[PDB]
Structure formats: structure tokens, C-alpha cells
Amino acid sequence: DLSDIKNSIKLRLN
Amino acid sequence: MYAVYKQAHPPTGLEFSMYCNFFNNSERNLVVAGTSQLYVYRLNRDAREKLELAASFSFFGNVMSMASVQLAGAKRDALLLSFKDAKLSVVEYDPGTHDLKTLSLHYFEEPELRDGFVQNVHTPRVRVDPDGRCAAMLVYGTRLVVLPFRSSFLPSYIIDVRALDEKLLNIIDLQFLHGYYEPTLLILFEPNQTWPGRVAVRQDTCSIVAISLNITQKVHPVIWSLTSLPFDCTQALAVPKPIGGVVVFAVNSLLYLNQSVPPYGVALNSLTTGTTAFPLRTQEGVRITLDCAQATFISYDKMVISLKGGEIYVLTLITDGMRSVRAFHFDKAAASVLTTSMVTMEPGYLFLGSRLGNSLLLKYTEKLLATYSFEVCDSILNIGPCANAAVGEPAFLSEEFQNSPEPDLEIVVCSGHGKNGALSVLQKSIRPQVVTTFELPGCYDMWTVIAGRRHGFLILSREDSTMILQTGQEIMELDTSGFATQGPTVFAGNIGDNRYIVQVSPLGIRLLEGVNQLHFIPVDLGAPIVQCAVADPYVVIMSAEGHVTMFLLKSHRLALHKPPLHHQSKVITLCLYRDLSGMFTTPTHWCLLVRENGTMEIYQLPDWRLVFLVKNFPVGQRVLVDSSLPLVKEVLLVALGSRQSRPYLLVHVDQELLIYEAFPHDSQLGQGNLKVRFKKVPHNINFRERVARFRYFEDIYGYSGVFICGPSPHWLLVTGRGALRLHPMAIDGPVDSFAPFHNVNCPRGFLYFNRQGELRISVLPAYLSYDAPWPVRKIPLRCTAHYVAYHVESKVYAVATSTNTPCARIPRMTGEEKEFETIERDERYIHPQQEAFSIQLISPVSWEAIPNARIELQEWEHVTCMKTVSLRSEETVSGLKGYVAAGTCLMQGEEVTCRGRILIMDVIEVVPEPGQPLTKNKFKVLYEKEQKGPVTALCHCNGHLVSAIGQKIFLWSLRASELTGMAFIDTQLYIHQMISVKNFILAADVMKSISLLRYQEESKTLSLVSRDAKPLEVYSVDFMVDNAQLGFLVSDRDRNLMVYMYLPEAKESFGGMRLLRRADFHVGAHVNTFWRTPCRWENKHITWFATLDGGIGLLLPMQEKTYRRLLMLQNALTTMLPHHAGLNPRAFRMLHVNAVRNVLDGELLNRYLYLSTMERSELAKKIGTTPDIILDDLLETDRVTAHF
Amino acid sequence: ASVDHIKFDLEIAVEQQLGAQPLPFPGMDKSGAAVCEFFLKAACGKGGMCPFRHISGEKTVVCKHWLRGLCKKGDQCEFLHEYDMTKMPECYFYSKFGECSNKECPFLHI
Amino acid sequence: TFDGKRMRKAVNRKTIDYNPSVIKYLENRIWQRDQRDMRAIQPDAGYYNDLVPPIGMLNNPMNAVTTKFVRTSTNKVKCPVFVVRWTPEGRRLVTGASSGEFTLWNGLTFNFETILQAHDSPVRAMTWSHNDMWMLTADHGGYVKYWQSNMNNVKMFQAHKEAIREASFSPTDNKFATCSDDGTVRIWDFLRCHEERILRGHGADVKCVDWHPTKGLVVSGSKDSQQPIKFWDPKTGQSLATLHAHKNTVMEVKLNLNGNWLLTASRDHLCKLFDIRNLKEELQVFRGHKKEATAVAWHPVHEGLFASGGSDGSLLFWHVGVEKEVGGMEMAHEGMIWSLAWHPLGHILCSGSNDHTSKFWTRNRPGDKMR
RNA sequence: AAUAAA
Ligand SMILES: [Zn+2]
Ligand SMILES: [Zn+2]
Ligand SMILES: [Zn+2]
């Protein structure tokens, strides 16, 4: 009643 | 033989609650207590509703009763706290130090008051007169203490209830009555006791009296009395002023009494027939019991009752035209948690305190007689009574941390009871979930700037260059921009309303909108810039020589202003603060400064005028007061909580961390001064081994707080609850820099640098809640949980659960075969309860039950034990295999012979069902045969199975699903616990203590080695392993811990036939479970335990020299410091029955870290030592016990 | 937490029979006591006063009194004092009358 | 003549089994702080699985008033019973009769187990050590014997030249004291069987003796009216005090385990309580026996509860601090009751009487009509 | 086998 993905980022480094 | 006790998790579970003026006479607060802890809460009604923590204190004792009173001429209420064995203390809140103040302490412990009895079975109880004229306290069930009120206290006297006009023998309850010109006390007692088994010969045994107390003359006659009441009366409640009288609760009856009218009583079910001669009528439409109910008054004629099972009822007193009660009205409103107390806060608000579940705050409104409906508003977490615990491995861990030498562990415990039963998963440290890692060696500092709150740029500072990266769908480096790349940067951040970016170089300051430069200001103060701070419109920079200049954003551009600061001493560090809470009074802006001489000052930013001054800041006073060496490296003011209403101050001095919190103090001295003071906060963070170490963040997985870098990184979180949480992050290593990060691939994450040059992108795991002392997840079961075991090979958990059903038959063993009788009663009969058991599998990948993997037992079968057992198997490479074993018994009363069963199960892997990847595991039963007696305990010993069947212990051998007996021995009355190390067995008895057994494989013989010859009620047992010494650790009914040793050469052992006690310690809680782990110290292990009050503790062996060195410090701390409520730490830990006292108290030793360096050195010199050695000894124990 | 690499003092004390004293009275039963390891290796110059059992061979029937815990002979008992259900004595009633009234009879029904 | 060689049919036995109550108590104490949290037991016949042992009802000692008859145990060749005692773990009950024989009865189903001839004279005394290792008995001829749990005799010697009435052990049970009809009390060394002291001064027969739980003190009761009760120092053998508690023969003298109280029974139909710290005045007088009081026994779990027996066959229950009896039965036995013994759990009581009979009693069940 | 069926 009442009771309370991986490696998806790429680095384009110059 | 020596050890130190430490507390790892504070207890949870409330037992008392009230509503009084704790801080001042303008507002009332909710005050709750349980065991050794006290809390004060506030109601924040504009957040919905939410309970907000305001203060918390701990004592060296367990609270037995609680009350409050308003004295004469006072600005506050005073609390009356009772402690075991007749101790009474009066305490009050102290404004000025933000602490507790002790007003009085009374002792009534002379042996002449006990009348020759040694065992005390009565708890002290405190009652307060409604008009505040006096207080009463009943001790040992026979003596009444009276405290008159006007100094504010008058001398007290003792009344003996056995020498009254009548003789009072077995007091049930006592209350003060409303009205009357003198304090009048009503007492329920039972001169001739009886019990439900002998009702047919002794029926009406309860009586009641009322005595009027004359304080001045010390005389007290009897003015009202009744004699014939039902034998099953439980409690009484005083009706408020307009009606008066008293309401008496019985198990099957309800009564209303008054001085000038005949009594009125009703019956609630049909079990009153033949059990009482009191004239009662039938209440139509009601079938209940009031044996363990809680009640309180909502109005002058309405009451709220919480039944056992959680049902909520509203009771109305129906009166005539002359305020005379003539009827009752019952209404069934709702169902809620099982409670221990309740109190009304405001019109329409209720609080239900719980020890077996979560405490709730309700809200009731009248529906449009009167009817009400209830609704939940807030809840307080409680991990309940910890009955059993298991240690296992987390299901998920990122691949970057899978080569760590240290193991990764977690704890699963059984909590709650009945409809509130659950499983709690507990972790201590935070493990980040790495998304991506990059290798960028050569960087020292980094920042993220917002370019609708997603970060747009990442700035990295090298030795002589700066790298700029855009953070969008892909992270790319920029080679041309308005930024500066030829030299290192000092600071980067956002100015304005997140519309501009400010970059600070050692030669000047730059203002940027996007990648386009707007303005540049060369800065030549005579020394290079070393630090910069940024407020909302304000920017303040400081040179290396201590020169300070300020910039303002004017409609935009930056304008220069020179602060009028004196030059009596050089400035070393500074910080800026923006206040949105209104506590800083004399949005506003402020500045904090630290000088070389050792003074701290606070100024107003638009006009640099002084408002605060501390004379000896670096030493670390416990309270900072306005007065208008160690080296300080950094300061920071932040505001946390809800709507940024809790300012805090963090200081980095030498190799120590100081934490302060601000509280208002409106002193009437001076003019134009800040009305704030600061109080020190205890912690256990070690900095022992310009880049900022404190880094504020908001909105990381919905949390705000401060990250602390260094050798031991920590998280600091404050939510709308208002409690401070400190969570370590020891995985990986020391952290160099840290920054928040909000990206499409990293939603609400963060960044940090490893010390190996690796940049990691991470998010917080989402299956735990961090608003708790430890991160925790609760899995409701809606039934009682008894045992839990972890299967290593299958990586799943087995839980034995029970649920209740009505009873319908009575077994009999009169004939050759068992016979049953059907119960036949009327329609107002209350049925007895019957329990049914089951075993189910839980998966750690998703904390849910595996379908079609349930085992159901027989009708009257109870599970008495369930363990993971390693048995011999000729199919592995080690010769052992893991199984789950259980023992059962059939309960059918005292007149039927009890027999048991042994179950051995395995967990296998099968082909998963379509659309169900969780059904790849199932049980497999190998042995389910019945034995010639009840099975009470199970264990394993060197590949064999050990069982306690009746008053014997057997060893078995398993081969092709068959158990073969090998040996047996006779034992004591009842064995309920067994543990084994190598080829030795330790067995525990219900009433006859412990014993030690040995097994010889060559001759197949079981023999007794030694035993304890004195009585003891044992709760649980385990081992202690230091290097080569083996000790036996025992729990007690009197809440003690003892260590036993086997010493054949000692003269007191009589040749080795008796076990000798070697250590002693009184913990104020019951312990039912133990486990061990190695130190994080060559061959030593740590023994952990969980208490029935929801806490966690541990014992750690220590060397003799260190123990003797720390004992002097413990004695000095005991004798030279004040303690809350005036209690004595040394007496609390003394054994309750000679004691041997070979265990240190780690909670008292923590007070040495709370002192300032001056008093630390003063105390160290008094015992002829050095603070450095003491600090090393105290920090080593903290280092070696960092598990989970 | 493994303890397989630790040699406790308890094990050494038990193996070396430290603190053992002769029995106070002659004729005491050594029931529930360990087996003397020294006696099996031509040692234990203690005679009949040893607190531990000296084991003699040529025993093949389980002692029924020892099962009830009422054996008086002790070391001089000529029946096996081990828990072996295959060497139990034959049932008297099943062998003299042809039937047994005990459903859980532990004696051999041949 | 019985030799265990006669064919018999299968029989169902009445029993009182304590295991379900212990299991229920173990389950209850996990989530209950104390008896304050314990739910009530209704007086109805359907509430049979709600019972707990006396250790779970510390606030209501009235649960242990055992007035429900269970069984009568009698020998084939019957003779008056003098001593009854329980085995230290409650596995068996041992009976000492006037023929010098011991009889053993099963503790769960009270049926015959074994019998043996122990003495050539009536058995008068029987006690167990505090370490549960030794049993000591004495007979009308003045002999003392040492026994083990398997009922094997290892030592025998003569202590007095006349009848011995009682014996008791020291706290470390290395010494023990005896009383005899010759009017003396003697102290012995257990391991050497060596006499150490002789205590004289009663002037008549000595009927009872007791040793203090911890302090090393000995109390004796005699038939002489001038010296009814005396206190002795075992180390030196000197007398300490004299108590004129009763005007008739003193039959029993027992010390509570708390170390404060002394219980006395006499032939003037009275039982009395004393505080050994202050012997100036009496504490309580228990009236209600219509004839002489001949036996007492403190409850093993409840501090203030005890039971008494009478020469007319009565059996009453008392509590310290209460004026009248809390229960009893007028005709439990025929003839005089000689001894009483509580089960170690405290839920069963045994009696031994002059009518050649031993009986067992237990707690009343909820819903009993008691008629 | 010393009372396994008392
Ligand atoms: Zn030997
Ligand atoms: Zn034998
Ligand atoms: Zn048979």
C-alpha cells in the first residue's frame, strides 16, 4: 500500500 | 593476544522519536535516536517534501528512553536521556560551538536498591508531566525517582512502590494524566502473575491505581483504583485535556476509564470467550489484535494505530453532549511499514520510525464521520538486522583494472523481516566505468570549458606549450585559433553567463568568445602570475611576490581595479566565493586571504573592507571565531546541498586536510562583522606520501560535490538530504588532475589523468546509490530471508526464504499413523500462522531471480542451516568440488518426535530457453534422504561432511550419491554452530559454551581436545589468525566478544582440559555472522562481522609493543577530554558479567586526529613520546584495512 | 583466506602430546580419547596409565554397548569400537523367530 | 525375569521433545530485541508452534509451573525411592533406591534402559561435578564410590562409620564435604581420598550440608534444637556463626547461585529465606504446607523460583517476593516425597517418593481445560 | 557379550 558502448571516441590528434 | 576494534559502518534503525524545540523557540524539529546515535532533522517543504539533516551526535552508550521538557526562562528544550543500569542525563544544544552541552548527570546504582537480585530484566523508563512540573524514572521495577523543577533543578528523592497504600508487584506501564492541580501518575500492575497456559485457574489479574504527588511535602496518597481487569493488558495512553481519562490496550480488548463514570469496554474478536469475566460488548465489523501496536493522538478525539503487520487504523471516541465517551469507531485506512514508534509533526504529517525497515514520512488529508487517506513523502534507508552475509565477486569490471594484484569483492547480506525482507549489496569504494583511454605523456594540468551544457573545448598544459581540442562527435586538435599555444597556461574557465572564455597566461589575460580573440591585457606586476580565481563577474589574479589585482567584466570587456590592501604581511593564497544561501550577512561576493604571519581574512569584493579575522589559522582550531608555522598551500569555499545552502571550507596545510562547515552566529559585539562561525569535521583522509587539488563539479550522474586528488583520491558528495559522504577511489593509482565532461559519447561523465600518462574517459556505474555511508543496492523480496550462499563455479547466489500462511490442522501422534484434526471455530476467530520455506537462485549480472530454479520443501519443514561445502571429487585437478548443503527439521509441537533431512545440491549449465538468456542455470539434487533425528548444524572437514544430528556429531563420505558413516561422538544439549580449520572442529552450544574436536584419518577416530566448563549463551563463533597463534572468537547474549586459547602447559588449564580466556571487549550490539580476509602483516587476517543493529565492525591483531604504546594514549584520552552526556568511555567497553582487557578502542583513538597540533604536542609530551610515532601507528591500521 | 602455509602451535602441541599426565585411577575408560601415536611406533613407556588408546588388532564385530555409551572394558574390550555398519552383529529376533518388529533395525538380517 | 530376549510388538511412545521450541526461539531472537517485541500466545489449542523454552520468557517465570502429569516410572521389584538426579546434559535420569540399585530412564521417552547393583546398603546421596566428569554416591553403610558417565566404578572407601546423608563439591571440585548421623562434618581431598578436617559442634545428627558457589563456605543443618544451623570455614575448621531459624529438625539447606540467599526447610511445616550478608533477621516465611517440608529445588533458569515437597505427598511452587504460593497440587504422590530434580532446560520436573514411584511433570499447554 | 523387546 504505502511503503517506499566502448571505444566510440576517436582522437584525430595532429 | 592483542587486537584493536574499529567501526566500518555506523548502525541504522530508529527506536525513539519526538517533536520539540531543539535549536530555538521559533521552530520545532524532529529528533530521533537509535542505540548510540542521535539525529536532528528539518522539514523542507519547497524542494515536494524532504527531511534534511541538521545535526548528529554519538555517545558511549545505548539509549534506553528519551523525553524533552521546557524549563523556566530558557530559550530551548532540554533532552532527558536514560542509559542502562539507572543513568539519567540532561543535555541541551549549545549555540556558539554548534555542539551539545551537559547540564546534569545522576547515578542510582547502589546495591541496596536491587534487593539481592543479580540479573536485571527491567529497563529504565522516563516520563514527563504535561505541565512541566516534574519528571519520573522507574528503575529495577521497584524504585521511582522524582525530579522536581523550579538553578533549574531541585534535589531528587526516591519512592518505594512496595510500601505504598497498596503493593505494586509487576508494573506494565505508567503515564502522567492531563488536568488535575498536582502531578498525577497512573500505573498498570499485576500483583498475581499468570500466563496463557494456566488461564483456566487464574483469569483476572490486572489492576490500576492513580497517585497524586506532593512535591514540597513529599507525600503521595492514592485517589483512584480499579481491581478486576483482563490478564492480557499491554499498555495505556492518556487522553488529552477536553475529555480526560485513559485508554488501556489489551490483546483482544479495548477499554476506556475515567474517575467518575463506569468503565466502557469492547471485544475485538471471539477469543475473549472463557478468558475474562469483564463486561464487554461486541464491536461490529472489527476483527483485530492489539498485542504489539503503536498509537498516537492526532486530535482530542482521534487516534492512529499501527498494528503488527503494518495495517493502519483510525479510532474515534464518540462522546455525548457532556464530553462523556459512549462508543468507538474503527476505520481501516491503509497499510505501511512495521514500526517501533510514531509522532505527529505538523497538521497533516506523520513520521513512522522503523527498526526492521525504512522509516517513512506520511501525509494524510480528510476525504470529501470523517475519513482520511495517507500517502508517502520521504524515506530513510536502513540495512536492517544483518542476519547472514556472503562475499562474492562483482559481475562487471572494466578490462583496464583486470590485472590488479588485489581482489575485487562485494558483500551481500540478508536484511529486514516479513514484508520488509530484502537483500543488500554493499561496496565501499567507487570503481569507474572506463569508456576510452588515451596516451598523452607530458601534460600537467587540464580544464574543460562550455562552448545545453555540453563541453566544447579541452585545454591541456604542457611544459612550454598548450594543446587545444574540440569535443564533439570526434575529438580533434586545433592548430590555428585565438588561444595561446606557445606557452603554458595558468587557468581556463568561463566568464559571464557561460558566454565567454578566459585564458590566463604568465604574461597576461585573454578574453575569448569562440575561437576568435576579443581582447588582450598584458600584466606586469613585477613577478609572473602563479594563481587566478574567477567569480561570476569578477577575476582576481596574484603574482609570485604576493601582488593582487582584480578585473571586472563590463559591457563586453575587462577593466582593471586596484584593491586597497595593506602590506603588513605577504599574501600566499586566496580564493573567491559567491553566496546564494543568505548565510553570509553583516547574490554577494567575497574573498578569502591567507598571510605569511598566519592570519586569515575575509573581504567584500565591490569594496575591499574587512569583515573577519582569524589569528592562528594554520594550527587548526576546532572552532574558528572572529578576533577583530605549518605552510598553507590551498583553500576553497564551496556551497553544496539543495539550492547551494551549505557552505564548506577546505584547507591544504603541510600534509593534512582540514574540513570546516559554516553556521550562523549573530553576536552582539562590534559593528559590520560577518555573522558566521566554522566548525571542524572529522575524517580519515591521508595526504602523507601550482596544480589545484580541490576541483568542484556539478551534475556528474546527477550529483554535485568536490573531487580530492592526490595519493588517496576521494569523492565528496552532499545531496538534498544534507549529509556529508566521503567515498574512496583507490583503483588505478594516485590521480594527477580531474575535470567534468559532458559529451554525446560520455553523457555526464568525467576526465582524469593517471600517473602513467594515461587519460581516461569514464562514467559512474548506474546500479548503485551513492547517497549512503556506503554505496548500496536493495533488492526487495516481500518475504523473510534466512541464509545466503555463493557458488564459486557458477557465480550465482542461493537464498532460503520463508512466507506465512494460515494454519488449518493440528497434527497428532496418538495412533500408529499420524492423524490430523480440522480446526472448527466461528467467523470471528483469528487463525494461527504457519511458515513455508523455499530456496531460489539469484543472478549477479541482473539482481533478479532465475525462473524455473525454485525448490519447495514439505508442509511443516523448516530450514535450520545452509552452507557452501567443499567435498572430495575424483574429477578435478585439486581433489575438491563445491556444493550447497542444507539441513531441515519438521516442527509439529512438543508431543511429536522431531526428525530431519539432509539436502545436497549442485548448480549446472544448460541450454538457454529462447528469449531468456538468464535460464542457463538450474539446480541438480544429488541427496535428499531423511535421517534418524533433527539436523541442526552442518560443516566440512578435509573433504568430508560433518553434521549434528540430535546429541551426536557424525562424519560422512559421499560417493555416487550415497553417504557413508565413518565416525561419531557424543555432545551437549543442542549444537547450532560448527566451523573447522584443517582437521579441527569448533562446536557451539545453546547453553553450554564451546568445545574443540580433532579427527584422525588413519584410525578414523573422533576425539575431544578441550572445552569450556562454564555456562555461556553463544551467538556465533569464528577464528583469529595472527602468525601461528590460533584463537577462538565468541559472541554473547550480553553483547560481548571473547577470545579463547588452548594452552596445555599453563597451570590453570589442568593439563589442557579447559580453554582459557585471553581477550575481552564489550560491543553494544549482537553479532550473528563472521568472515575473514587477509591484510592489504605477513600472515595476519582480519575478522569482520555484521550486527543485528545494522553496523559493520572488524578486529585486527597487533604487536605487543604497539599495543602497550597505544594503551597510554587511550588512558590519557579517556581522562583528559570531555565526552557527550558525561559518559565514561572506559566503563562502556568493560565486560558485562574478571576481565582481561586486551583489546583497544579505535573510536576513542580517533579523537587524537581531531585535536589541533598545539594540544597534540602538549598531550604527547605528557606521556613521553612524539606525535610523529603516534600518527604513524594510527595511520598504519587505517592503511592495512582498506577492503571492499 | 587460506591457512595451508601456516604451522600453528596447536598442531605441534597436539602432535607432541605436551602436558599429558598419567590417569589418576586405574581402570578408567579411554572413551572419546585420541589414539596414541607413540604406541604404534614402539614408544610410549607409560604402560596402562596412558591417557590415550593403545590399539590391538583382530577385532571384527562392532561393540553394541559402545553404541549406547555404556562400555566398561575400554581398551580390553574385544569388540570393534569403530562406526562400521557392515560389521554389525546379527539380529537375534530375525534369526531365532524369523521376523523383526523394528522397522529401523540396525542389526544384520541374514 | 527380563533379559531382552522376548518378542514384543511395536509400540508408540508418548514424548516431550524440546527441539521445536529451541528452533522457534532461535528464529525469534534474530529480529526481536527482547520480550518487549515478542508477540502474544493465544490461549487456544491451535497455537502449538508458538512455544519457547524458559530462556525466552525471562520476564514471566510463571510459565515454568509444571502441573501437568506425564508418566509414572516403576521398577519390577519396587522399593522406596530416595534420590533422583539428571545426567549433566539431560540425556538420562538416574534413580537411587533402598535396595542399593541404580535405574536409568530415557530423557525423551521415559522408558526403561538399564539397571545395575551399586551398593549393598540403601543409596542416600548422589551428586555430579561442576566439570561434568565425575559422579559421587554414598550409602547407609558409610561408603563413598566414584563413577564415570559409563557407570564404571573406579574407587571405593569408607568415610564414616554410620549413615551418610549428603555430599557436596567445592567450586573447583577438588574438595568435598560429607555429613553423617555421628554428628560430624568432614572435608576430603578428591584425588587422594584423604581426610583433612573434622567439624564438631552440632551435638546431634547432621542431615544436610552445602558448599558456597564461590566463597568457600560450608553450611550444615542438624536435628539438635540448640544448634540447628551452623557456618564453617573449610580451610581452618573453625565455626563462624549459629542460626536459630527453626524449632524442629532441619531437613534441607540450599544456597542460591547468586551467592546471597539461603533456603531452609524444616519439620515445623515452614520454609524460610535468609540473606547471608545480614543474619540479624529473616527475609521471608513461606506458609502453606499442611505437613512437614522435606525437599526443595531452585529453578535452573529463573532466579527467584523454586519448588517444594511435603511428607503428605504435596507439591507447591513459590516465588521470592510473593506472599502466597503460585501453584501446586494437593495429591501428587502418596506418602513422603524424598527428592526433586529439574531438567537442565527447566521445562520438566521429576519427583521421587516413598510409594515406590517416580513421576514426571511438565508445563501446561495453551487451551487446556485443566479439569 | 553386561537386560537389545521393561
Ligand atoms: Zn600411550
Ligand atoms: Zn566395547
Ligand atoms: Zn532386527
Residue numbers in the entry:
A (entry chain D): 720 to 723, 735 to 744
B (entry chain A): 1 to 47, 63 to 165, 183 to 400, 458 to 540, 569 to 672, 680 to 710, 781 to 822, 843 to 903, ...
C (entry chain C): 6 to 115
D (entry chain B): 42 to 412
Which lines from the publication concern this structure?
Within the human 3′ end processing machinery, the four-subunit mammalian polyadenylation specificity factor (mPSF) recognizes the polyadenylation signal (PAS) in the pre-mRNA and recruits the poly(A) polymerase α (PAPOA) to it. mPSF consists of four subunits, CPSF160, WDR33, CPSF30, and FIP1, and serves as a scaffold module to recruit the catalytically active proteins CPSF73 and PAPOA to the pre-mRNA substrate. CPSF160 contains three β-propeller domains (BPA, BPB, and BPC), which are ordered in a trefoil arrangement, and recruits WDR33 and CPSF30 for high-affinity binding to the RNA. The PAS is recognized by the N-terminal WD40 domain of WDR33 and by two zinc fingers of CPSF30 (zinc fingers 2 and 3) that become ordered upon interacting with the RNA.
The final reconstruction at a global resolution of 2.79 Å was overall highly similar to previously reported reconstructions of mPSF in isolation. CPSF30 docks onto one side of the complex, interacting with both CPSF160 BPC and WDR33, whereas the CPSF30 zinc fingers 2 and 3 are ordered because of copurification of cellular RNA. A peptide-like density docks onto the side of CPSF160 BPB, whereas an additional shorter fragment (about four residues) contacts BPA, overall matching the binding interfaces between PAPOAC and CPSF160 predicted by AlphaFold2. However, although the predictions suggest a continuous interaction surface, the cryo-EM reconstruction shows density for two separate segments, together burying a surface area of ∼1400 Å2, indicating that the connecting residues are probably flexible in solution. Moreover, the PAPOAC peptide density was slightly less well resolved than the other subunits, suggesting comparatively weak binding affinity between PAPOAC and mPSF. PAPOAC binds to CPSF160 using a combination of ionic and hydrophobic interactions; PAPOAC K736 forms a salt bridge with CPSF160 E489, whereas other PAPOAC residues (L721, L741, and L743) point toward CPSF160 pockets lined with hydrophobic residues. Indeed, these mutations impaired or disrupted the interactions between PAPOAC and CPSF160–WDR33. Taken together, the PAPOAC uses the same residues (L741 and L743) to either interact in cis with the PAPOA structured core or in trans with the mPSF subunit CPSF160. The PAPOAC–CPSF160 interaction thus appears to provide a second anchoring point for tethering the poly(A) polymerase more stably to mPSF.
